[model samples]
Target: SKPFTLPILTLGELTNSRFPLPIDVLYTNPNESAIVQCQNGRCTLDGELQGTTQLLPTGICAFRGKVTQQVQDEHRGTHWNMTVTNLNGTPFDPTEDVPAPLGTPDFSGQIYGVISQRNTLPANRAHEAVIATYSPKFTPKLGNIQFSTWETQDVSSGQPTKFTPVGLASVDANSHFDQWTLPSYSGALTLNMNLAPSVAPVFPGECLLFFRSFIPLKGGYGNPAIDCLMPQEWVQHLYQESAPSLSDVALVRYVNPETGRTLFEAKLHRNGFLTVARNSAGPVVAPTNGYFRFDSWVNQFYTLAPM
Candidate 1:
């Protein structure tokens, strides 16, 4: 038998001039980033970063930032992409990376959380800045001083759980730990967090990183901010679980209600064990008939009522 099987069909890109080849799954090396520009049914994902790749049926290609994945649908209404990165912090520009308290996570969908540049950067260091997710009623969750970078770098190579370094010049026996939001001027406060890609996605429902930012810097000191990250997709599922023990785990099932078909399924054990299905890469179109639901658990008996 063949070691692996290719996708039943591949999607293609269409430049402004003409259409290209029907490309299948796209893969990246490591440490890379690509920008996908799409118009109509044609799209392009090419950048200078390493470990970057593109996939699709064209039309506004979704970005595949850091990690790698195959496509299952040609068009799911919303453009999608899994951007991969090695750096744990949010990448922002010192001069231009001003916090746009009103801006959302460059995306609109079921988001998990944003990455934390504050914790990723070594203690007393800073990296890039980013805009926080826009929320009319929710409180600003900026916990502690943090940093991040979208540029792919070997975060694992660093001190394991360390942030990029940023130090202050000797201002005549002054404390180096003191950092300002706007480096030049001690104005806006900073925010921060505690995990790799520490930020959580905008939509907690999808299980991703949300907005991770630097805590508002303080002149003296209060609580120093909690500095923590929202739970990862896996961890969130755990917390959502009443008893997070290996014996009682979560199972995921993708079904086609009308046809009574089981499209996809997954099993997440208590030991943080998750089995991702790479075999089902074909597009599973959602019926325009009724509401579709994704369910999970163990032995179909654990009974973890979704919160």
Candidate 2:
């Protein structure tokens, strides 16, 4: 039989009915409680109609504070869709003025984080709100056992003034470097690193996860950049792979040698399933010692191998 093939059609050359380009913009918020969708110039509320679809910007769209069900749409069209959600009551603000873009440490007008808000004690009683938004779907790992004493970030503003574990116990403007009981190995642990860029909407950098262990005589090598290249300009995911082992008692470091900067950083203690690879497991209930570091391709160049 002869090979039957569909006729070729250039983007604007073919007639409207002859070549219908299916255009879809699928948006996913994997934050556990959020699921939204838009399709065929139509917006649906029920999660039952969830899917991946491209919507026309002319459609009436609204965002659900707490999307109940899953929904999506697939359309062969153009960029004519806009989906807006109401986040006034929620703990998030579309405009992040609190933690303003890098170069300035102005988190004032920015939307207060749930964790920051809940940290307010004594009279506010705001802890309940924070507790409600908690998601068990969070990734977990082992805590650090031989973590550095303490550290602080170089808030020189040469960067975006992002906080990090730089020198010993210099977290506070007053303290130089001292060991503390932070980065606790309990509950869901989320680590934020580095400052944002100057021109881009958000400063682009890489967030690396480090896994460590305390079962041997001295700390050898456990940290891995579980979450490869982040805040990328081209690829959203690079070096996409899981932590090599699960017995990760702590997160080490994969600092870049080029500029002595960190490109990948995460905590693979005992609880979080992300980046917590095997080979780091032990028998004793030792204390894990480590911290999370977010690095990117732009500045992830160090000179030495991870210790």
Candidate 3:
């Protein structure tokens, strides 16, 4: 973890990077007012605290100004080292600290929803079940969040559920409510389940999906985002209607198997009926015979087809 720096929030410095959740900063004093809003990594602090002249979407406030020092545990992984007195520049009380968000004993389930696998292929579909539940612990003092994951296979009707345990990398966060994308590992195994009459999903190989969640700022507490869910991946999966015909533009990567390196990659459309694969030899060639590893949900692979 690198040393994380929390910029001293100053007038016009726009302080919206404090937490994963978006926040609106409001300053109110007699004769003057100002507002700062941050969302989706972009920040807007329209009014100047105090100057000869200032402009805003709304009218301006008319006070000279007073500010306070505030600490935000927004960025995780790095220790946010700073004193919490007179944040931004207001009165000082060293002993006082903002309390963490209160517990929600009756809190709703996962914010987004249950973490489940998606199978795009009609033939490869199998029921996904949560055989067990996990409880991860957050260590606020040490700035570490730890959790364990398990990969399980469906078993016979009467047999016990066998779970393969997966370990996680230590995560750091400024607040327990901060969201994090953690990585974990799982072994490849065959799931026991009644299959559809079509084909069993092909095994391109054992692979790991992404783990995303919210880690509680406090230790021993649970953050609702903590669960198995797909972190958004880069490749978009196209289907019957969505997939392009030979004439539509598409992007792909060609890899050298022995070197396990990308030979050439680009967004291109087919010329005539074939998508040409070009190499450093300066000649176009046919793509490999094997699958190029396309969509994970449906166990589908991308390949050039005849028009």
TM-scores, all models, native as reference: 0.22, 0.15, 0.17
- Model 2 stretches with alpha carbons more than 4 Å out: 1-240, 254-256, 259-267, 273-307
User: Could you tell me the lDDT of residue 146 within candidate 1?
Assistant: 22
Give the Cα error of residue 169 in candidate 1, in Å.
34
Candidate 3: clashing residue pairs, number: 16
Q: Best candidate, lDDT-wise?
A: 1
Give residue 89's error in model 3 in angstroms: 40
Ranking by lDDT: 1, 3, 2
lDDT per residue for candidate 2 within 209-297, as digits (tens), equals 21111111112232211111111110111112222332322333434344555433333222221231122222212112211232211
Sort by TM-score, top down from the best: 1, 3, 2
List the global CA lDDT of all models. 0.23, 0.18, 0.20
lDDT of 3: 0.20
When 2 and 3 are scored with lDDT, the better candidate is 3
Model 1 TM-score relative to the real fold: 0.22
Query: Which lDDT tens digits does candidate 3 get at residues 105-136?
Result: 11111111111222223222122211111112
